[PDB]
């Protein structure tokens, strides 16, 4: 109790406890919906405008 | 010609580590209450805390 | 005669130059690229625009990638010629980069001046000044459109453009903190300029639209970007007037594998003033005439290259109680490190020490990971501020260890660190891989 | 509308630019590197430091590789403003590199000035000036610390760092000859400045510390470095006075693969004076008023870009009795060669001719191997030197084949050639691959 | 000196100095097709 | 009236204009713990939010806990593992002439009385948890630092 | 953004390319496939003496 | 704008033109009622 | 001035609103500001210039 | 923001759960002592979730 106790000694206060770990499991949500990227011509248009014959 | 085998700055015997060294030792020995260990077991701690080397073998011939 | 007379000059040492050729210089090879188009689209700014106001924008998903961002301001000058010093950027006190609720970076008005002071050179420094200041002796009442390009990690090279197509859930936002005091527009020194107009601003965002084969890839694969961050805290300085050269030992609070450390000594009242004022050409208002005063800069020339008016005598970085390099004089950090590492000119009062071979580039080239340092301290020696600022005979005729008495006004020290980190993006969400 | 519209118009002309994409510009993949740290360490200089003395220093092997060296001088100016012209470099008369007792390279104060004059460019050269001269109209008695970075094959790119870790059997050291005459510090022209202070000198070296895995390999493996070195001998000019255009045939003593030759016509008494003096602003002391004298420069502006004050009319290089090119006038070599080859500006009186496509780089890009050429000459034609230097009406209002009568002071000729060699490191010993 | 920095290899650095791919201090140059450069005068036809 | 001596028995006040703090921020390892807040936040808002009492002017608190007034653990900042904790202060400009009530009762939060420069001592407290262990007649702190 | 230099007054640039100053293709608009390419200008009122 | 793509874009003069071309009778008058002062209102009058 | 709100999730942590569990629902607050504030811009019904 | 104006805000999803919300105002009074009565509270005309 008097001399076998726990304390905080330098090296145990190293900044790497933050700089080795992400905030990602702490700031991210749980999103089950997939990403919806799709073909460009579907939105952009079909280029239907008499392009020059070569 | 110089004949100086040692390079000339801190590398091989110097153990240039940061004080995080403390957690490496705690991990090696497993318990956070490190204070009692080297008071009772010093040899194992000294053996596990020093560096190795690499050699240079070149010659020209007689 | 001619070229044929030299081709024949072939000897044994050419096996290292022209032996078994691998490259021919005169028929090069180009690489075909994924088709893309760049469109500059206006964003909507939330909040009231004005002096001292804080406004923000939510970046609309107008495209697949986002890269260059430019913030424009409209300012009316309230004074005559030579009364402003980059008013467009000083108006913008900081910009916060937030992706999905987590801040990734933050830049400051003073950092923009420091970054410009170090890493931009030649025509880009002059253009930047054109983009942020009045440089043609314009007079009172002149009004113009200013552009303050942003420098977040994804703002200078397409190689780090953020994948909005892969950030379909998390929003990206920029918060803009505007200044209450803008020299020559809203205030002249600390004196308010009656009738000063409120600024008008807009945020320009340049979007890249990709073709099908790559854009669906971006939304398919997880991504990891090796990015830059800025770290910043302010410090108070100890600058003596006489009999001594003070020491100061500032304990640093930096983390991450750091590319370089840069700092400047400033007068918090006069934006961009990193040197003492003196009664010499370009060093103070009215310099060289009977009306000269060393309390007010000749603002259009606030920046100088005359280190005699700078206050740092020497500095060293000490890590865990042992010096990182032997003590260097203040001029090493002002003249030599940017020569070796950037290739530009750093004005007096701005100092740089690199850990990197090429800190101006984005290719990783050496870092100091301060998360592993238990005691990171910047030790400073100041010059003695005993030289009479109003007497050119002394201001330009003194020793290396002394500077002007007006250097005692440089009470704030701004210490910046630029470091690497990794940005992770997947399933529409993003965030910073290593916290801090 | 917008970027999508541009993507829609995709057709045949895009197949060779984008069809079957090979690259993207928006997902740049960085490379991972070997851990290293950089430190600047000062060494001990063996020899007495002072005007006219020779000193040397052994590079204390405080690291694994040597990447850069910056020489520092502390000078007190002995004259008024505008009386100095690169005084740190004039003092740094000659720097010689020795590895294992053998001379590797030598660089003279005039080479530093010539290299600065025609190869170093941008704000980087202005900053260079900041490091070696007084650039803020400073007054007599001012003390300033100067930095002169060295320009040996190893100083600018880390890929050529000196492998001292692998040279355990040899010393690496440099010899420094200090000038006895430094303009504006201990002499004004040929007249001594009483009470001038002796310089203070130190040499700083940037050491690379490598990690365990890479330094093991460097120490155990043999290495070969493809390097550049400077060949130089000074000679004499053939400048005429009136009625003629002198010719000179200079037998060259260069060998090894040369990437360029460069030369200047100088006044050996006034450091850096590569042109004639004249009564034009910045062209001589007192220029523009009645006190103008054309025997002494207005030193702080010793260098000029007015080619009419240059003495060379035309030049040709001939190899083995046949012309290497048809004769060009002097302005070609002063204005066009550096435009085509390096993309910079060269001041009047300094000339370049290159063999390399990019002579400023390290990657070989064309060389003339003067070890397999038996007789190489430089043919010069001089301008007639009949214009009265004291009348700007005659100097600023005349033709190309004439110059000022004061051009006859440019009596010393310096022809430089830089070429390739290979530095071999085997069994702990270094040495050159090719002799002569 | 710099050793206090060099030693500090951590978890975040696997993205920088882990599993090295390149070295910055040993450059390998590419050998090129032998060529010579000259500039000569053309005849201009016309007044 | 002598503005250098208080009417001692009524020394405590609730008038924020006589309080020193313009703003405060707590920063942990170079990273802000929250954005800078104005001094009245620490004097009045958090005591309302987490304690339920009234704090006189010049006394400030920031909580890490839902119930800092209680004994039940309710949220803690473990300073035994944080390398650098810094409390950043911004002062009000002490330009008001304390002898003129028209000025002291008629100004904004960023200024205070000239007599404020007498408040020369800064006292910052931290209250925390540890465990007191008792075994076979012996007692002691398990976590002492 | 596209070059990294300064352009004098009266000279204007709009790029379709990331690095128009370089030779490596970095983004193009093919005006052989656009039927109506128009540059619309607004002029300043030239009222100042 | 639908998903980053422009679908339509109307200007004030188009609204005037449309009101001039396609709205007729009571609808044009009620439009007027919604966008202007139609009762000789005086300085200071405010309307939704 | 600081005006705390007194909604169901404002006074006790036990009813804290879990944005984390509302991934797809954005939470908005509407604020209507009074036109007349006694002693600030009106004294009774009389405007304060 | 202003007298008689209506504004809204969208709570930024920075955390996991929301507890208290405090709306702050900066007001300057135009009256004498004893001429105001919870001016920040009446300014806050209404709040909707």
PDB file of C-alpha atoms in Angstrom, chain F residues 10-145:
ATOM      1  CA  UNK F  10     -19.915  42.545   0.316  1.00  0.00           C
ATOM      2  CA  UNK F  11     -16.699  41.634  -1.518  1.00  0.00           C
ATOM      3  CA  UNK F  12     -18.431  38.914  -3.522  1.00  0.00           C
ATOM      4  CA  UNK F  13     -20.322  40.206  -6.555  1.00  0.00           C
ATOM      5  CA  UNK F  14     -22.166  38.904  -9.607  1.00  0.00           C
ATOM      6  CA  UNK F  15     -21.301  41.810 -11.928  1.00  0.00           C
ATOM      7  CA  UNK F  16     -19.390  40.313 -14.856  1.00  0.00           C
ATOM      8  CA  UNK F  17     -17.951  43.709 -15.815  1.00  0.00           C
ATOM      9  CA  UNK F  18     -15.623  43.466 -12.787  1.00  0.00           C
ATOM     10  CA  UNK F  19     -14.446  39.985 -13.838  1.00  0.00           C
ATOM     11  CA  UNK F  20     -11.075  39.517 -15.535  1.00  0.00           C
ATOM     12  CA  UNK F  21     -11.483  36.624 -17.983  1.00  0.00           C
ATOM     13  CA  UNK F  22     -12.424  37.489 -21.530  1.00  0.00           C
ATOM     14  CA  UNK F  23     -12.041  33.950 -22.816  1.00  0.00           C
ATOM     15  CA  UNK F  24     -10.480  30.569 -22.036  1.00  0.00           C
ATOM     16  CA  UNK F  25      -9.683  27.353 -23.901  1.00  0.00           C
ATOM     17  CA  UNK F  26      -8.265  24.053 -22.655  1.00  0.00           C
ATOM     18  CA  UNK F  27      -5.786  22.468 -25.030  1.00  0.00           C
ATOM     19  CA  UNK F  28      -4.542  18.873 -24.727  1.00  0.00           C
ATOM     20  CA  UNK F  29      -1.374  17.843 -26.623  1.00  0.00           C
ATOM     21  CA  UNK F  30      -1.596  20.766 -29.073  1.00  0.00           C
ATOM     22  CA  UNK F  31      -5.214  20.077 -29.968  1.00  0.00           C
ATOM     23  CA  UNK F  32      -8.130  22.077 -28.712  1.00  0.00           C
ATOM     24  CA  UNK F  33     -10.473  20.220 -26.323  1.00  0.00           C
ATOM     25  CA  UNK F  34     -13.353  22.586 -27.342  1.00  0.00           C
ATOM     26  CA  UNK F  35     -13.402  25.889 -29.192  1.00  0.00           C
ATOM     27  CA  UNK F  36     -12.525  29.037 -27.265  1.00  0.00           C
ATOM     28  CA  UNK F  37     -15.454  30.188 -25.070  1.00  0.00           C
ATOM     29  CA  UNK F  38     -16.072  33.654 -23.485  1.00  0.00           C
ATOM     30  CA  UNK F  39     -15.546  33.991 -19.697  1.00  0.00           C
ATOM     31  CA  UNK F  40     -19.254  34.242 -18.821  1.00  0.00           C
ATOM     32  CA  UNK F  41     -19.616  30.676 -20.153  1.00  0.00           C
ATOM     33  CA  UNK F  42     -17.335  29.324 -17.395  1.00  0.00           C
ATOM     34  CA  UNK F  43     -18.800  31.626 -14.758  1.00  0.00           C
ATOM     35  CA  UNK F  44     -22.462  30.967 -15.464  1.00  0.00           C
ATOM     36  CA  UNK F  45     -23.466  28.376 -18.058  1.00  0.00           C
ATOM     37  CA  UNK F  46     -21.696  25.113 -17.016  1.00  0.00           C
ATOM     38  CA  UNK F  47     -22.566  25.615 -13.285  1.00  0.00           C
ATOM     39  CA  UNK F  48     -26.172  25.794 -14.435  1.00  0.00           C
ATOM     40  CA  UNK F  49     -25.773  22.771 -16.747  1.00  0.00           C
ATOM     41  CA  UNK F  50     -24.010  20.404 -14.403  1.00  0.00           C
ATOM     42  CA  UNK F  51     -24.216  21.719 -10.786  1.00  0.00           C
ATOM     43  CA  UNK F  52     -27.450  23.686 -10.425  1.00  0.00           C
ATOM     44  CA  UNK F  53     -26.089  26.564  -8.346  1.00  0.00           C
ATOM     45  CA  UNK F  54     -24.866  30.122  -8.828  1.00  0.00           C
ATOM     46  CA  UNK F  55     -21.200  31.110  -9.205  1.00  0.00           C
ATOM     47  CA  UNK F  56     -20.114  34.658  -8.303  1.00  0.00           C
ATOM     48  CA  UNK F  57     -18.195  36.731 -10.822  1.00  0.00           C
ATOM     49  CA  UNK F  58     -14.494  35.980 -11.164  1.00  0.00           C
ATOM     50  CA  UNK F  59     -14.865  32.286 -10.282  1.00  0.00           C
ATOM     51  CA  UNK F  60     -14.846  29.897 -13.217  1.00  0.00           C
ATOM     52  CA  UNK F  61     -15.420  26.207 -13.776  1.00  0.00           C
ATOM     53  CA  UNK F  62     -15.113  23.806 -16.676  1.00  0.00           C
ATOM     54  CA  UNK F  63     -16.472  20.308 -16.179  1.00  0.00           C
ATOM     55  CA  UNK F  64     -15.515  16.959 -17.675  1.00  0.00           C
ATOM     56  CA  UNK F  65     -18.376  15.375 -15.707  1.00  0.00           C
ATOM     57  CA  UNK F  66     -22.145  15.210 -15.908  1.00  0.00           C
ATOM     58  CA  UNK F  67     -22.451  15.654 -12.109  1.00  0.00           C
ATOM     59  CA  UNK F  68     -19.251  17.267 -10.780  1.00  0.00           C
ATOM     60  CA  UNK F  69     -21.087  18.109  -7.546  1.00  0.00           C
ATOM     61  CA  UNK F  70     -21.797  14.474  -6.816  1.00  0.00           C
ATOM     62  CA  UNK F  71     -19.718  11.574  -5.580  1.00  0.00           C
ATOM     63  CA  UNK F  72     -20.840   9.209  -8.352  1.00  0.00           C
ATOM     64  CA  UNK F  73     -18.195   9.076 -11.128  1.00  0.00           C
ATOM     65  CA  UNK F  74     -19.735  10.750 -14.160  1.00  0.00           C
ATOM     66  CA  UNK F  75     -17.083  11.470 -16.779  1.00  0.00           C
ATOM     67  CA  UNK F  76     -13.387  12.187 -16.288  1.00  0.00           C
ATOM     68  CA  UNK F  77     -10.323  13.547 -18.058  1.00  0.00           C
ATOM     69  CA  UNK F  78      -7.439  11.324 -16.997  1.00  0.00           C
ATOM     70  CA  UNK F  79      -4.561  13.764 -16.706  1.00  0.00           C
ATOM     71  CA  UNK F  80      -2.195  10.962 -15.659  1.00  0.00           C
ATOM     72  CA  UNK F  81      -1.774  10.136 -19.366  1.00  0.00           C
ATOM     73  CA  UNK F  82      -1.845  13.582 -21.061  1.00  0.00           C
ATOM     74  CA  UNK F  83       1.615  15.019 -21.848  1.00  0.00           C
ATOM     75  CA  UNK F  84       0.609  18.639 -22.132  1.00  0.00           C
ATOM     76  CA  UNK F  85      -2.489  20.246 -20.709  1.00  0.00           C
ATOM     77  CA  UNK F  86      -2.594  23.985 -21.210  1.00  0.00           C
ATOM     78  CA  UNK F  87      -5.205  26.487 -20.122  1.00  0.00           C
ATOM     79  CA  UNK F  88      -5.142  29.380 -22.590  1.00  0.00           C
ATOM     80  CA  UNK F  89      -6.371  32.698 -21.195  1.00  0.00           C
ATOM     81  CA  UNK F  90      -7.411  35.938 -22.901  1.00  0.00           C
ATOM     82  CA  UNK F  91      -7.723  39.040 -20.729  1.00  0.00           C
ATOM     83  CA  UNK F  92     -10.142  41.943 -20.933  1.00  0.00           C
ATOM     84  CA  UNK F  93      -8.652  45.375 -21.464  1.00  0.00           C
ATOM     85  CA  UNK F  94      -8.521  47.117 -18.062  1.00  0.00           C
ATOM     86  CA  UNK F  95      -9.309  50.602 -19.380  1.00  0.00           C
ATOM     87  CA  UNK F  96     -12.406  51.662 -17.421  1.00  0.00           C
ATOM     88  CA  UNK F  97     -11.851  54.340 -14.775  1.00  0.00           C
ATOM     89  CA  UNK F  98     -13.127  52.549 -11.664  1.00  0.00           C
ATOM     90  CA  UNK F  99     -14.132  55.801  -9.974  1.00  0.00           C
ATOM     91  CA  UNK F 100     -16.837  56.635 -12.551  1.00  0.00           C
ATOM     92  CA  UNK F 101     -19.921  54.407 -12.201  1.00  0.00           C
ATOM     93  CA  UNK F 102     -21.293  55.696 -15.522  1.00  0.00           C
ATOM     94  CA  UNK F 103     -18.372  53.980 -17.263  1.00  0.00           C
ATOM     95  CA  UNK F 104     -18.261  50.805 -15.163  1.00  0.00           C
ATOM     96  CA  UNK F 105     -22.018  50.222 -15.605  1.00  0.00           C
ATOM     97  CA  UNK F 106     -21.999  51.271 -19.266  1.00  0.00           C
ATOM     98  CA  UNK F 107     -19.482  49.125 -21.210  1.00  0.00           C
ATOM     99  CA  UNK F 108     -19.019  45.821 -23.041  1.00  0.00           C
ATOM    100  CA  UNK F 109     -17.656  42.451 -21.917  1.00  0.00           C
ATOM    101  CA  UNK F 110     -14.218  42.903 -23.511  1.00  0.00           C
ATOM    102  CA  UNK F 111     -13.163  45.704 -21.118  1.00  0.00           C
ATOM    103  CA  UNK F 112     -13.011  46.006 -17.331  1.00  0.00           C
ATOM    104  CA  UNK F 113     -11.854  48.354 -14.568  1.00  0.00           C
ATOM    105  CA  UNK F 114      -8.298  49.660 -14.280  1.00  0.00           C
ATOM    106  CA  UNK F 115      -8.334  48.288 -10.697  1.00  0.00           C
ATOM    107  CA  UNK F 116      -8.284  44.765 -12.204  1.00  0.00           C
ATOM    108  CA  UNK F 117      -4.448  44.827 -12.458  1.00  0.00           C
ATOM    109  CA  UNK F 118      -4.404  44.217  -8.648  1.00  0.00           C
ATOM    110  CA  UNK F 119      -5.719  40.629  -9.196  1.00  0.00           C
ATOM    111  CA  UNK F 120      -2.172  39.272  -9.403  1.00  0.00           C
ATOM    112  CA  UNK F 121      -2.741  35.654  -8.330  1.00  0.00           C
ATOM    113  CA  UNK F 122      -4.094  32.859 -10.577  1.00  0.00           C
ATOM    114  CA  UNK F 123      -5.407  29.809  -8.680  1.00  0.00           C
ATOM    115  CA  UNK F 124      -6.336  26.791 -10.794  1.00  0.00           C
ATOM    116  CA  UNK F 125      -7.705  23.685  -9.079  1.00  0.00           C
ATOM    117  CA  UNK F 126      -8.318  20.132 -10.240  1.00  0.00           C
ATOM    118  CA  UNK F 127     -10.390  17.619  -8.264  1.00  0.00           C
ATOM    119  CA  UNK F 128     -10.143  13.946  -9.111  1.00  0.00           C
ATOM    120  CA  UNK F 129     -10.550  10.239  -8.365  1.00  0.00           C
ATOM    121  CA  UNK F 130      -8.108   7.733  -6.852  1.00  0.00           C
ATOM    122  CA  UNK F 131      -8.712   4.640  -4.721  1.00  0.00           C
ATOM    123  CA  UNK F 132      -7.919   4.319  -1.014  1.00  0.00           C
ATOM    124  CA  UNK F 133      -7.260   0.690  -0.199  1.00  0.00           C
ATOM    125  CA  UNK F 134      -7.274  -0.841   3.284  1.00  0.00           C
ATOM    126  CA  UNK F 135      -5.759  -4.237   4.080  1.00  0.00           C
ATOM    127  CA  UNK F 136      -5.172  -5.808   7.522  1.00  0.00           C
ATOM    128  CA  UNK F 137      -4.963  -2.500   9.347  1.00  0.00           C
ATOM    129  CA  UNK F 138      -2.820  -0.749   6.747  1.00  0.00           C
ATOM    130  CA  UNK F 139      -4.152   1.905   4.410  1.00  0.00           C
ATOM    131  CA  UNK F 140      -2.935   3.644   1.326  1.00  0.00           C
ATOM    132  CA  UNK F 141      -3.409   5.177  -2.103  1.00  0.00           C
ATOM    133  CA  UNK F 142      -3.344   2.746  -4.984  1.00  0.00           C
ATOM    134  CA  UNK F 143      -2.724   5.521  -7.541  1.00  0.00           C
ATOM    135  CA  UNK F 144      -0.327   8.206  -6.295  1.00  0.00           C
ATOM    136  CA  UNK F 145       1.101  10.855  -8.637  1.00  0.00           C
TER     137      UNK F 145
END
